[PDB]
Amino acid sequence: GMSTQYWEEEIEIMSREKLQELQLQRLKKTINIAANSPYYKEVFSKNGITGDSIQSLDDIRKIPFTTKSDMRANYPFGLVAGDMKRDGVRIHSSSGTTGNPTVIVHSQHDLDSWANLVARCLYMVGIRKTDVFQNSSGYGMFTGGLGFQYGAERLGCLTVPAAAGNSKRQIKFISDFKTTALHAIPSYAIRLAEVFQEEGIDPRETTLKTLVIGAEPHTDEQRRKIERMLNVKAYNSFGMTEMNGPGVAFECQEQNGMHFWEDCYLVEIIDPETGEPVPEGEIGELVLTTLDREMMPLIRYRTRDLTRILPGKCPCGRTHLRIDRIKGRSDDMFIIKGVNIFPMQVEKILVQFPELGSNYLITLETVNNQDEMIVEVELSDLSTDNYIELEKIRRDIIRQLKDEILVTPKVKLVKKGSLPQSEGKAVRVKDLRD
């Protein structure tokens, strides 16, 4: 607190009263912009939302929630409010070809606001322009790639856009370029420490000092295990494509709850049953409204993430609220290797193969500290194929699943009737991870 350094001091230690004043000003601006989108223009017309409906921050509960289903219904540009042809500079899309994915469109302002938030996060945990920042996140459509790339360049780091995979190349970059800061998912940070030992390098004696980990749920003990393996300080990083990507919520150097940047997001913790705010400090669904987005703002978006607001002031001096770890979700979505997957994406691929039966089972396991996804599917006794032909089909199933869910799964063709008789519900994901 007495010796804490801030990227934007005036905003990061802003009084709660002036912070709420800033939220209300940006909330009115966001509602007036979103009114230009075809989607929110209909929502505001149906629910009588005018430019005078929002007079306080509590007036936001007048607006209905925006769901993933509504965004799929208005795919691809139903929620675009700005001039996409003149001001639109980027699209970020979620995985899939069997269904309508999620699309977020950004203007140059939106990219700058997003890069500033990521720079604010990196600076908060002690990362400076003198640091060598390596990003092991996937690039392309994944917001983790370009998100940290623009943020680290904005801070002034010597960036190493390593991208995903190739552990031996990740270790080569750290050794040759003297990397000090690394962005990786918790499970891959353990893999890199393992590969360091395989190549005869002490993972505790590298140039690494700071680690940024997120994208998937992990315990505080898992993080402390990563800190001991690599002799580093690891910080929890939260974000999602709908909210830009990285830079949404981030731990401070106290490593106790993730500070949510309330100047760019309005945070609500909602009871998934009633749809009403939970008692202060209880676990509920995270519902978010963008406050600095102009091309495609999102109002009261149901993340389906479950968390709580941690009570008490933080010793770092920052007044922005802190959320607890995200330990689960209120929908059927699962995360493997940091990638979000829906079970229907797997089913929509399997049904295309007449050699397969309708009964399938997706099992998630931890092997050698790395996450593995196994897809068991029964064979239809209609299959008039031998071993060589069925094995060629199995490889095609792996290929079509890899293209759809963006992770390589293990496909096992099992005998008809071998898989256990389900309760008759769509619950077909058996997670066996700790």
Ligand X SMILES: Nc1ncnc2c1ncn2[C@@H]1O[C@H](COP(=O)(O)OP(=O)(O)O)[C@@H](O)[C@H]1O
Q: Has 202 been labeled as part of a binding site?
A: no
**What 3-state DSSP class applies to 86?**
helix
Q: Which is nearer to its own copies, 371 or 404 (CB)?
A: 404
Binds ligand X (CB under 6 A): choice among 23, 66, 74, 94? 94
Closest residue by Cα to residue 79 from 27, 43, 26: 43
Segment lying near Zn ion (by CB under 5 A), choices 51-59, 128-136, 189-197, 249-257: 249-257
160 interacts with Zn ion by CB under 5 A: no
Cβ atoms of residues 210 and 235 within 8 Å: yes
CB atoms within 10 A of CB 320: 23
Residues that bind ligand X (rule: CB under 6 A) add up to a total of 22
Q: Give the one entry of its own copies, Zn ion, K ion, none that residue 316 binds, where binding means its C-beta sits below a cut-off of 5 to 8 angstroms depending on kind.
A: Zn ion
Does the annotation list 241 as a binding residue? yes
| Chain centroid offset of residue 60 CA | 25
- The option from its own copies, Zn ion, K ion, none interacting with 252 (CB < 5 to 8 A, set by class) reads Zn ion
Residue 95 annotated as lining a ligand binding site: yes
Among 79, 75, 110, 109, smallest CA distance to 93 is for 75
The answer to whether the beta carbons of residues 37 and 78 sit under 8 Å apart is: yes
User: Is 121 known to sit in a ligand binding site?
Assistant: no
158 touches K ion (CB under 5 A): yes
237 binds, among K ion, ligand X, its own copies, none (CB under 5 to 8 A by kind): ligand X
Residues 11-30: x/- map of binding to Zn ion (CB under 5 A)? --------------------
Cβ(177)–Cβ(161) below 8 Å: no
Binding mask 303-332 for K ion (x = CB under 5 A): ------------------------------
Site for ligand X in 168-227 (CB under 6 A): 214-217
Binding residue for its own copies, selected from 24, 31, 114, 145, defined by CB under 8 A: 145
Parallel, antiparallel, or unpaired for β 233-239 and 246-251? antiparallel
Judge whether 278 and 286 are in contact, CB under 8 Å: no
Q: Which two tokens stand for residue 270?
A: 């909602």
C-alpha span between 49 and 59 (Å, rounded) = 10
DSSP sequence for 299-340: SSEEEEEEE-BPPS--TT---S-EEPP--EESSS-EEETTEE
Residue type, 332: D
Quick one: 63 or 127, whose CB is closer to K ion? 127
Is 178 near K ion (CB under 5 A)?
no
Instruction: Give the residue, chosen from 135, 159, 170, 241, that forms a contact with ligand X under the rule CB under 6 A.
Output: 241
Please confirm whether the linkage preceding 246 is cis (ω < 30° from 0): no
Please give the Cα distance from 146 to 183 (Å, whole number).
12
Footprint of its own copies on 112-141 (CB under 8 A): 129-130, 139-141
How many C-beta neighbours within 10 Å does residue 171 have? 20
Residues 257-316 that bind ligand X (CB under 6 A): 303, 305
In the complex, which residues of this chain contact ligand X (CB under 6 A)? 94-95, 142-144, 214-217, 236-241, 303, 305, 326, 329, 335, 338, 340
In the complex, which residues of this chain contact its own copies (CB under 8 A)? 75-76, 84-93, 97, 103, 105, 108, 111, 129-130, 139-141, 145-146, 149, 153, 156-164, 166, 168-169, 172-173, 176-177, 403
